[PDB]
Motif scaffolding. Structure first.
Motif, PDB file in Angstrom:
ATOM      1  N   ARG A 131      19.315 -58.856 -50.246  1.00 36.99           N
ATOM      2  CA  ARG A 131      18.363 -59.839 -50.737  1.00 36.99           C
ATOM      3  C   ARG A 131      18.961 -61.236 -50.772  1.00 36.99           C
ATOM      4  N   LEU A 132      20.280 -61.351 -50.912  1.00 42.32           N
ATOM      5  CA  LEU A 132      20.908 -62.660 -50.803  1.00 42.32           C
ATOM      6  C   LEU A 132      20.853 -63.183 -49.374  1.00 42.32           C
ATOM      7  N   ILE A 186      21.288 -55.985 -53.540  1.00 45.00           N
ATOM      8  CA  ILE A 186      21.374 -57.391 -53.919  1.00 45.00           C
ATOM      9  C   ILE A 186      22.079 -58.237 -52.868  1.00 45.00           C
ATOM     10  N   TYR A 187      22.899 -57.633 -52.009  1.00 46.34           N
ATOM     11  CA  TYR A 187      23.508 -58.371 -50.908  1.00 46.34           C
ATOM     12  C   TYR A 187      22.522 -58.589 -49.774  1.00 46.34           C
ATOM     13  N   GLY A 229     -25.500 -62.966 -49.752  1.00 51.76           N
ATOM     14  CA  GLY A 229     -24.623 -61.992 -49.049  1.00 51.76           C
ATOM     15  C   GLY A 229     -24.210 -62.439 -47.665  1.00 51.76           C
ATOM     16  N   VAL A 230     -22.952 -62.171 -47.330  1.00 51.59           N
ATOM     17  CA  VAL A 230     -22.381 -62.485 -46.028  1.00 51.59           C
ATOM     18  C   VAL A 230     -22.181 -61.177 -45.285  1.00 51.59           C
ATOM     19  N   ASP A 231     -22.554 -61.157 -44.014  1.00 53.34           N
ATOM     20  CA  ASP A 231     -22.392 -59.970 -43.183  1.00 53.34           C
ATOM     21  C   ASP A 231     -20.979 -59.963 -42.615  1.00 53.34           C
ATOM     22  N   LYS A 278      17.216 -64.397 -48.979  1.00 55.91           N
ATOM     23  CA  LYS A 278      17.120 -65.745 -49.520  1.00 55.91           C
ATOM     24  C   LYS A 278      17.655 -66.764 -48.525  1.00 55.91           C
TER      25      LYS A 278
END
Ligand code: MG
Ligand code: MG
Ligand code: MG
Ligand code: MG
Ligand code: MG
Ligand code: MG
Ligand code: MG
Ligand code: MG
Ligand code: MG
Ligand code: MG
Ligand code: MG
Ligand code: MG
Ligand code: MG
Ligand code: MG
Ligand code: MG
Ligand code: MG
Ligand code: MG
Ligand code: MG
Ligand code: MG
Ligand code: MG
Lengths: 181, 187, 124, 53, 50
Positions: free
Chosen positions: B25-26, B22-23, B1-3, B29
């Motif tokens: 999102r273009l 869609i414009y 176990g990690v604390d 991109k």
RNA sequence: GGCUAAAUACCGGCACGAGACCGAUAGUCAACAAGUACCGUAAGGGAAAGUUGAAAAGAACUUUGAAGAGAGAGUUCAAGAGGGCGUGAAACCGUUAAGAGGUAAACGGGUGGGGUCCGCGCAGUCCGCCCGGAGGAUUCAACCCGGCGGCGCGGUCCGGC
């Protein structure tokens, strides 16, 4: 009409069945297990003894409360009874099966009970009156019965004292036959 | 176990626009590429504001764009807003502006163009300013919404100038007890 | 544009099949039946299609002309090649590389041509 | 008295009529709608006004 | 683990059992190691250990 | 003191049309001889209940039985649809087959044995190029005619929109 099993050689077998027969399913299931595998003459003789309390039907599965008898020792068992209606109902079916063998030209003296099966039929509703203005079920437990008989190599003739008996005439059958004619 | 604690492992931040446009999102991109393949932090800021929601993209009025594009040293710089440029009827004279925006209202378009200005789209900004050079990135007022009047210390606490939620405004609507010392108390 | 038209159809198309964790595209001039921006056979100005000939002999290589982009009736140029296997592939390779007509579809077109010709051999 | 009906802004309804018309003039979108227009001479398809009669 | 030991073990970066670190010694650090005495084995490594 | 149409209302009635509704424990209580049968002195309360088949062709006739029931025969595409008959689940039961059985049974993990079936297995893959032996041809390149296509910074051709 379908039977739960199929005969191995249909040309060497005869069938019988009945439905909604008003005989106890539990008593008749035990009775059928007794004659399973028997030769017809042996099976017929055995059931007549049950009617006369000379041989017992061992109650193996539906044995809750049933009593002990000396005749149950013949079956390696302690509990046995003598259901008369089950024996008579099955005797009728054997007689019908024997006739079906004749109608097919089989050797009735070689037949063995190969398959026999008792099924619960639909129950019939009556009622009984209980204390405090209560009404409870009073049910009959009828059964369907089906048997298949098959020819084997052992031959057992019909008893002489049984073939010598008169062919009983029924007036009520004649009256209905003449009316139908 | 990690604390260690795990309640803050997942960072709450947009990796894309919730919009299905869609414009838009273009354009994402486009600026996903520019932000990745150029060292220009301006591209990263624009890419981030394209993901932003409607309330994180306040409209920039015409009067406020003129003020910020009139500070010294900002001549011939393209004003850029990832949002809508709205017209301001309180302005009398519109100078010659070069602006890039997602939307410019119909009356703001006529006034900018009629003064000899240029209105760009973000796909035209990339071709003209691939790294964002010579730009003035501008934002509308984010706290300029009616909700922010209702936020802060609850209205019924000392020195709380938060706006309450009242179905109606008038003398009969939340002004007696707690708002004047003559009725119980004030704070 | 192609990119704009891909945003409309990438997940909404009569040619789109989604099934068994797979996606295919049944439109003509798609060389791999793949729902993809590269292999879509409708949204690009230039496309390559390889189909079997009307009879089971040879392949038909379809190329989209440059001019009539909005005129579907004259948009596509069909060419039937019914040579030996190695000669058929050479023509397709030349029709693509020498013309520089979608050089990224060169091997996909060549692989589809080899699959059509192989299907036209007698079944063992 | 379920709310069976919806108000749509006029500007958005007209927006929707414009997108439908723009998308109706592109062969890829019309083909992707399932229409067999592989031999229609042109898109948009305009026919003389005789057909109205 | 008690809060004061839990903080000191996090500052040494020993957040897991059998984790190891070098710690240069001085008044500040030697007194941190005294708080976490039950939770650590420490000592002076030779050149081969490093 | 007085009258007055219209625009408005309408889960009753007569007659119609429709539905992103329900689909026989749903939808009206009521798909059917349902406000029926039935209960209550009464006011009142109030169900269950749809389906053979395309067509009754609804099983003549023979035979065992007192009969119910059976065995044959026949109709039908099918009674493996036989008059509360479409399909025909589970619980529960009979029988047949296999396995097993003194810590109630059941259960997770790991193997092992045996079955049922599957591989529609049982001398074991397919493909490119290359070498060699045997053959056979709608026979290759290079040129000529024609058609089509791509591109052209045609370093700056003509005409178009
Ligand atoms: Mg008991
Ligand atoms: Mg007793
Ligand atoms: Mg009484
Ligand atoms: Mg862990
Ligand atoms: Mg957690
Ligand atoms: Mg959290
Ligand atoms: Mg009046
Ligand atoms: Mg019902
Ligand atoms: Mg109902
Ligand atoms: Mg029901
Ligand atoms: Mg139902
Ligand atoms: Mg009902
Ligand atoms: Mg039903
Ligand atoms: Mg059937
Ligand atoms: Mg049926
Ligand atoms: Mg029917
Ligand atoms: Mg039924
Ligand atoms: Mg049935
Ligand atoms: Mg069973
Ligand atoms: Mg057994």
């Amino acid at each position: 009409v379908r039977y739960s099993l199929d005969p191995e050689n249909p040309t060497k077998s005869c069938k019988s069945r009945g439905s909604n027969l008003r005989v106890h399913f539990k008593n008749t299931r035990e009775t059928a297990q007794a004659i399973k595998g028997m030769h017809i003459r042996k099976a017929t003789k055995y059931l007549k003894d049950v009617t006369l309390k000379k041989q017992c039907v061992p109650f193996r599965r539906y044995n809750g409360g049933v009593g002990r008898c000396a005749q149950a020792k013949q079956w390696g068992w302690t509990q046995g009874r003598w259901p008369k209606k089950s024996a008579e109902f099955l005797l009728h079916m054997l007689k019908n099966a024997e006739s079906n063998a004749e109608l097919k030209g089989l050797d009735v003296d070689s037949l063995v009970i190969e398959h026999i099966q008792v099924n619960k039929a639909p129950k019939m509703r009556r009622r009984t009156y209980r204390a405090h203005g209560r009404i409870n079920p009073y049910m009959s437990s009828p059964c369907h019965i089906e048997m298949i008989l098959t020819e084997k190599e052992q031959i057992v003739p019909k008893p002489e004292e049984e073939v010598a008996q008169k062919k009983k005439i029924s007036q009520k059958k004649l009256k209905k036959q003449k009316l139908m004619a | 176990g990690v604390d260690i604690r795990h309640n803050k492992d997942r960072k709450v931040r947009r990796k894309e626009p919730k919009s299905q446009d869609i414009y838009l999102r273009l354009l994402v991109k486009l600026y996903r590429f520019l932000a990745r393949r150029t060292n220009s932090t301006f591209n990263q800021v624009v890419l981030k504001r394209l993901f932003m929601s409607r309330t994180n993209r306040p409209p920039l009025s015409l009067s406020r764009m003129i003020r910020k594009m009139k500070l010294p040293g900002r001549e011939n710089k393209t004003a850029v807003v990832v949002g809508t440029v709205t017209d301001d009827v309180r302005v009398q004279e519109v100078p010659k502006l070069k602006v890039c925006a997602l939307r410019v209202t119909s009356r703001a378009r006529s006034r900018i163009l009629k003064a000899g200005g240029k209105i760009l789209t973000f796909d035209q900004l990339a071709l003209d300013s691939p790294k964002g050079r010579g730009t003035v990135l501008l934002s509308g007022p984010r706290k300029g919404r009616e909700v922010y009047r209702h936020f802060g210390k609850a209205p019924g606490t000392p020195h709380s100038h938060t706006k309450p939620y009242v179905r109606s405004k008038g003398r009969k609507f939340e002004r007696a007890r707690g708002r004047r010392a003559s009725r119980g108390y004030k704070n | 544009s192609a990119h704009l038209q891909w945003m409309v159809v990438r997940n909404c198309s009569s040619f789109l099949i989604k099934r068994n964790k797979q996606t295919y595209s049944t439109e003509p001039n798609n060389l791999k039946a793949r729902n993809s921006f590269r292999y879509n056979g409708l949204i690009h100005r230039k496309t390559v299609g390889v189909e079997p000939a009307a009879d089971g002999k040879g392949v038909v290589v379809v190329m989209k002309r440059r001019s009539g982009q909005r005129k579907p009736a004259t948009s596509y140029v069909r060419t039937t090649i019914n040579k030996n296997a190695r000669a058929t592939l050479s023509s397709i390779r030349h029709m693509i590389r020498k013309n520089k007509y979608h050089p990224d579809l060169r091997m996909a077109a060549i692989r589809r041509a080899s699959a059509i010709l192989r299907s036209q051999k007698p079944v063992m | 008295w379920r709310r069976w009906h919806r108000r749509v802004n006029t500007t958005q309804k007209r927006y929707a009529i414009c997108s439908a018309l723009a998308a109706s003039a592109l062969p890829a979108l019309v083909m992707s709608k399932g229409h067999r227009i592989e031999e229609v001479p042109e898109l948009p398809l305009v026919v003389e006004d005789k057909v109205e009669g | 683990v008690s809060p004061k030991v839990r903080k000191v073990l996090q500052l040494l970066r020993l957040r897991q059992i059998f984790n190891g670190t070098f710690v240069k010694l001085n008044k500040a650090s030697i007194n941190m190691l005294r708080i976490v005495e039950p939770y650590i084995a420490w000592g002076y490594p030779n050149l081969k250990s490093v």
